[PDB]
Amino acid sequence: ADLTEYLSRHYKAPRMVLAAAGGLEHRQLLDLAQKHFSGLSGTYDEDAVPTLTPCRFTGSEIRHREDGLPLAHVAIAVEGPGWANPDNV
């Protein structure tokens, strides 16, 4: 039931992309997508729209002391800039 809820709430038409790359023309792809993807979705279960929340970066450390290992892994990280800003580049 939860699987069917997830399938219902996130396999929706407008959010998703069909894209092809290779030696083929756009008309063929558009017509085949018209003949097959006409009829997936477009409306939610009583408008239960999933929506992003811009979350918060905490900054902390979790250290898993486990000495019976040959090498040690460290990951250090800071804030992400985002996408559309050129600070990305």
């Binding site: 905490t58 902390s60 450390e61 979790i62 250290r63 898993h64 002391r65 486990e66 019976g68």
Partner: protein, 75 residues
């Protein structure tokens, strides 16, 4: 003593948070005051019976000083 060859530890995850995003004094007058009263409960039963016994001996010592230096005979 260097730093790194002290012991062998497995099976332990230590979480900890940054100093900035937590506050200075979390519930300072809310938990620290029962904290110090509990600490005082753990000690005074076996701290005070030296000191009050010392104190009564101090009072008695000054008492013997005054009453044995000031004599009041019969004459």
């Amino acid at each position: 003593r260097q730093f790194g060859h002290l012991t062998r530890v497995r099976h332990v995850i230590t979480y900890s948070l940054s100093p900035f995003e937590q506050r200075a004094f979390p519930h300072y007058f809310s938990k620290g005051i029962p904290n110090v009263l509990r600490r005082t409960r753990a000690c005074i039963l076996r701290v005070a019976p030296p000191f009050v016994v010392f104190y009564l001996v101090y009072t008695w010592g000054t008492q013997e000083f005054e009453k044995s230096k000031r004599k009041n005979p019969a004459a």
